[PDB]
């Protein structure tokens, strides 16, 4: 605002309002599953076992 009266009386009135905001969200979810199954031999009993 600028107000000049009689070309001699001056008045200035300068206002400012800055308002900044910031929001960040980060989510993360890692799932891992390893299943291993070896089967090497198969051991059976002879029918002639005592």
């Amino acid at each position: 605002t600028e107000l000049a009266l009689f070309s001699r009386v001056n008045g200035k009135f300068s206002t400012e309002f800055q308002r900044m905001k910031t929001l960040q969200v980060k989510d993360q979810a890692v799932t891992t599953r390893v299943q291993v199954r070896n089967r090497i031999y198969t051991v059976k009993t002879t029918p002639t076992s005592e």
């Binding site: 605002t1 600028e2 107000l3 000049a4 009266l5 009689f6 070309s7």
Partner: protein, 50 residues
Amino acid sequence: QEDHVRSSFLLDNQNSQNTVTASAGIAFLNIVNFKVETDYISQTSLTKDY
């Protein structure tokens, strides 16, 4: 061997800017003078991923 990979990316973004500059200046014959101005800047961003 069977392999499957499925990726999915989603991204969204939105910006909104408003500016309002309203001024009024009255100037008489070097007796009364009144100058006013109003500036209003607003700006919102928003990004969202997945």
